[PDB]
Structure 1
Amino acid sequence: KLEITLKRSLIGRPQPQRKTVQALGLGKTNSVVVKEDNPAIRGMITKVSHLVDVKE
């Protein structure tokens, strides 16, 4: 399991990144989700790694 925190804002970002952040369950900034360690979630994190903090 791993913990995911939205650190940056979505204003000014493209639609694909907003959709990816939506599918991760994250809402407002500084909000947190806890997920599993599938390759699917890792692919999501790779797409938006500049907007988010990941903690094992």
Structure 2
Amino acid sequence: KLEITLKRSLIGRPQPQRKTVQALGLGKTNSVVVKEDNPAIRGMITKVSHLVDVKE
């Protein structure tokens, strides 16, 4: 398991940025979800790593 927190806003970000964040399950700012450690999830995270905080 690992913890995902959206710390930066999506205003001013391109569409793939927003679609990836919206597919991760994050809503408003400072929102938290718990996922697993698949290669797909890490592939998402490396794409929007500048908008997010990752924790176990």
TM range, smaller chain: over 0.9
Unaligned runs of 5+ in 2: none
How far the C-alpha of 1:19 sits from its partner, in A, is 0.1
Unaligned runs of 5+ in 1: none
Aligned to 2:7: 7
Equivalent pairs, count: 56
Secondary structure of the residue aligned to 1:50 is coil
Q: Deviations over 1:15-54 (max 9, x none)?
A: 0000000000000000000000000000000000000000
Aligned to 1:42: 42
| Normalised TM-score (structure 1) | 0.99
Give the root-mean-square deviation of aligned CA atoms: 0.3
Query: After TM superposition, what 4+ stretches of structure 1 lie above 4 angstroms from structure 2?
Result: none
| Normalised TM-score (structure 2) | 0.99
- Once the two structures are aligned, what percentage of the paired residues are identical? 100
